[PDB]
Design a protein around this ligand. Structure first.
Ligand SMILES: NCCc1cccc(C(=O)CS)c1
Ligand SMILES: [K+]
Ligand SMILES: [K+]
Ligand SMILES: [Zn+2]
Length: 613
C-alpha cells in the first residue's frame, strides 16, 4: 500500500521570461511558480510531501509526442539572440521563446514523467508537478499557447508504454482547451480526454470549431473526447459541480481509469484576468476529492494555467490540501447551473448519449467503537473510544429517564454514551474527524445520535440510511435530509427525502453521482449520519460523501460484520478505494422520476434547460 503525496518543483523552471513587448504573453511570468511554492510553504503543505527531484526528459521520450523536425528546431533556440528568438516566436501563435526555455521544457516534461513513475511504482499515492512551461496547447510539430512540449500527453503515452495501461483518464480544468491533447488522442480509445473551456461561441482563444461539444473523437476513439464549452463568462461553483456530477464523473466511473492525469490550470478560478470565471479556489479541493476513488487514488496533478498571482496560491493549496487527505471545506450557496451551462451540458450529454448510455433520454481522524469484547487492527490513524465520562453518563441517564425509559440493557446504554462521546469529539473539537459505532437498538441509537447532533449545534444533518422500515427522523422542518436506499418501492412524497428502490452496482453508482451527491452538495450538511440495518459499493459512497460536512461523518452499523466494519473504517480513515470496473431500465426510469420530482427544489439535479410555462 502506497502512502504520501509527491511534490515536484524546481526553481530552474522559474528562470525564463518574455524579453520583448507582447501584451498577449505578458501574463505568463516566472513569478507564478514562486507564488505557488511559497504558498504551499506558508500553510505547511510542501513539507508534508515527498519532494521528488526534477529531471530532463530524454530525446525519445520527447519523440513520443513530437516530431524530429520540431524537436530539432527547438533544440536550436538556446543559441539565438533576442532578434532571432523573436523571429522564431513569430512563427507560432501566442508563444515566446527564451535561451533557457528548451532546458525548462525538458525539465517540465521530466518532472511530469517523474511524477508518473513515482505514482505508478507505488512510491506515493498521488502527486503534483509545479512545472513551467505549460503543455496542453502544444502539438506534434508546433508550439502554442505558452506551451512548448505537451507534458500531460507525454505522461499518458509514457504510462501506456512503460506500464501497459489500457485506460487513462485526462481531466483538463483549465479555461483553455487542450487542443494538443485532443489532437494527440482523438482516435485513441485508451486515453479518455475531458476538457471544459471558455468558448463564447468560438470567439475565444484558440477559436477552434473542434473545441465544441461536437468533437466526440474520430474513428475508434469516438466517445473518448468530451468538450464542454462555456459560452458565457462568470461560471460559478454550481456550474462546475454540475458539469462534474452530470457529465464527467459518470463517464469516468464507467470508464474505470487505471490512472488519472489532471491538467491543473487554475485560470478557471475567480479573479483570473484570462478566464473571468467566478469559481472559488476551494472548489478545486472537491474537483480533486470527487476524483479520488478513480484508479485507486493514483492521481497526477500537473500545472497548466493560472495568472492571478494573489489566488493561484489559494487554488494550488486547495488542490494539495485535498491530495493529502485533509478535510474539504464546506461549499455553501450552491444551487442550479445557469441557462448557458445547462445548454452546454445537455448538448454534450445528447451528442455523447450514443456512446455512454446513461445520457439517453425519452422523447487521529477516525474513532472506532466495536462490539463490546471484540479486538481489531485499526489503521495507524484510528483509535477506540476513550471509555466514557461523567457528563456523558449523566446525559445518558437524562435521555433514558426522560424519553424511552424502560431500558436497562447496559450494552445499548453504553452504545448511546459512545455515540454522544464521538459526536462531542467530532463537532465540539478539532481532533476526531469522523467515526463509526456498532449499535443494538436502531430506534434508540438513531434518535440519540440525531437529537444530540442537532444540539452540538448542527445547522443541518444529512442522513444516509440503507434498509427498510421507517426510521425515527422528521423531514418536515428544514434541518434534516434523508436519503434512504431500500427494497420496497415505498413512494416519493415530500421533498426532504430521496427514496431509492444483479446490475444494482451500476444503478447505485449512477444514483449516487446524479441524484445523491448534487442534493447533498446543495444541502451543505454540518454532519452526515450513516445507518445500515442487518454492500460492495459502500466504500465509494463513504469516500465521496466526505466532501460534505467538512468530513464529519458518524456511521452507525447494526450488525457485527467484520468485512463491512473494516471497509467503513478504511473509507473514513482515507485509504485508497479498490475500483469497480449497465443499469436496469426500470431503475433509470425511477431515477429520472426522482429527478423530475426534486429538481424544482434542488437545482443541482438539473442537466437540461428548464422550459417556462
Ligand atoms: N490573452 C492571451 C490568450 C492566451 C493565448 C494562449 C494561451 C493562453 C493560456 O492561458 C495558456 S493555458 C492564453
Ligand atoms: K480545459
Ligand atoms: K481520446
Ligand atoms: Zn489556460
Amino acid at each position: 500500500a502506497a502512502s504520501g503525496s509527491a511534490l515536484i518543483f524546481d526553481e530552474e523552471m522559474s528562470r525564463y521570461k518574455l524579453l520583448w513587448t507582447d501584451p498577449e504573453c505578458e501574463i505568463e511570468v516566472p513569478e507564478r511558480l514562486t507564488v505557488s511554492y511559497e504558498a504551499l510553504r506558508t500553510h505547511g503543505l510542501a513539507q508534508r510531501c515527498k519532494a521528488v527531484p526534477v529531471r530532463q526528459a530524454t530525446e525519445q521520450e520527447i519523440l513520443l509526442a513530437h516530431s524530429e523536425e520540431y524537436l530539432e528546431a527547438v533544440k536550436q533556440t538556446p543559441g539565438m539572440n533576442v532578434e532571432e528568438l523573436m523571429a522564431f516566436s513569430k512563427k507560432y501563435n501566442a508563444v515566446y521563446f527564451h535561451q533557457n526555455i528548451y532546458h525548462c521544457a525538458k525539465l517540465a516534461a521530466g518532472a511530469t514523467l517523474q511524477l508518473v513513475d513515482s505514482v505508478m511504482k507505488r512510491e506515493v499515492r498521488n502527486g503534483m508537478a509545479l512545472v513551467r512551461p505549460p503543455g496542453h496547447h502544444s502539438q506534434r510539430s508546433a508550439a502554442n499557447g505558452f506551451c512548448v512540449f505537451n507534458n500531460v500527453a507525454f505522461a499518458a503515452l509514457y504510462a501506456k508504454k512503460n506500464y501497459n495501461l489500457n485506460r487513462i483518464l485526462i481531466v483538463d480544468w483549465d479555461v483553455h482547451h487542450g487542443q494538443g491533447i485532443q489532437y494527440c488522442f482523438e482516435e485513441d480509445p485508451s486515453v479518455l480526454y475531458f476538457s471544459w473551456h471558455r468558448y463564447e461561441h468560438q470567439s475565444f482563444w484558440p477559436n477552434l470549431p473542434e473545441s465544441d461539444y461536437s468533437s466526440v473523437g474520430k474513428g475508434k476513439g469516438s466517445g473518448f473526447n468530451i468538450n464542454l464549452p462555456w459560452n458565457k463568462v462568470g461560471m460559478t461553483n454550481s456550474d462546475y459541480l454540475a458539469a462534474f456530477f452530470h457529465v464527467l464523473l459518470p463517464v469516468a466511473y464507467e470508464f474505470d481509469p487505471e490512472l488519472v492525469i489532471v491538467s491543473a490550470g487554475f485560470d478557471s478560478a475567480i479573479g483570473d484576468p484570462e478566464g473571468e470565471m467566478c469559481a472559488l479556489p476551494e472548489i478545486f479541493a472537491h474537483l480533486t476529492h470527487l476524483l479520488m476513488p478513480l484508479a485507486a487514488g493514483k492521481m497526477c496533478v500537473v500545472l497548466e494555467g493560472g495568472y492571478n498571482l494573489t489566488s493561484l496560491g489559494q487554488s494550488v493549496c486547495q488542490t494539495v490540501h485535498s491530495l493529502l487527505g485533509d478535510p474539504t471545506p464546506r461549499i455553501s450557496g450552491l444551487g442550479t447551473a445557469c441557462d448557458s451551462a445547462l445548454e452546454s451540458i445537455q448538448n454534450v450529454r445528447n451528442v455523447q448519449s450514443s456512446y455512454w448510455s446513461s445520457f439517453k433520454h425519452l422523447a487521529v481522524r477516525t474513532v472506532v467503537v466495536p462490539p463490546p469484547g471484540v479486538e481489531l487492527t485499526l489503521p495507524k490513524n484510528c483509535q477506540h473510544s476513550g471509555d466514557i465520562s461523567e457528563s456523558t453518563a449523566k446525559e445518558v441517564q437524562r435521555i433514558r429517564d426522560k424519553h424511552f425509559h424502560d431500558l436497562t440493557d447496559q450494552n445499548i446504554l453504553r452504545s448511546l454514551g459512545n455515540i454522544i462521546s464521538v459526536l462531542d469529539r467530532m463537532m465540539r473539537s478539532d481532533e476526531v474527524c469522523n467515526g463509526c459505532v456498532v449499535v443494538s437498538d436502531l430506534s434508540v441509537s438513531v434518535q440519540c445520535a440525531l437529537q444530540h447532533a442537532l444540539t452540538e449545534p448542527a445547522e443541518r444533518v444529512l442522513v444516509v440510511y440503507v434498509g427498510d422500515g421507517e426510521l425515527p427522523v422528521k423531514t418536515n422542518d428544514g434541518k434534516v435530509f434523508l436519503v434512504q436506499i431500500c427494497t420496497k418501492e415505498t413512494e416519493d412524497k415530500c421533498v426532504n427525502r430521496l427514496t431509492l428502490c444483479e446490475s444494482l452496482t451500476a444503478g447505485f453508482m449512477q444514483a449516487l453521482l446524479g441524484l445523491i451527491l448534487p442534493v447533498a452538495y446543495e444541502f451543505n450538511p454540518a454532519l452526515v449520519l450513516g445507518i445500515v440495518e442487518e454492500m460492495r459499493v459502500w466504500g465509494h459512497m463513504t469516500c465521496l460523501i466526505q466532501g460534505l460536512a467538512r468530513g464529519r461523518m458518524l456511521t452507525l452499523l447494526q450488525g457485527y460484520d467484520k468485512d463491512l466494519l473494516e471497509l467503513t473504517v478504511s473509507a473514513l480513515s482515507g485509504a485508497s478505494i479498490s475500483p469497480l470496473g449497465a443499469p436496469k431500465p426500470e431503475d433509470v426510469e425511477m431515477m429520472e422520476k426522482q429527478r423530475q420530482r426534486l429538481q424544482e427544489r434542488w437545482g443541482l439535479l438539473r442537466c437540461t434547460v428548464s422550459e417556462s410555462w
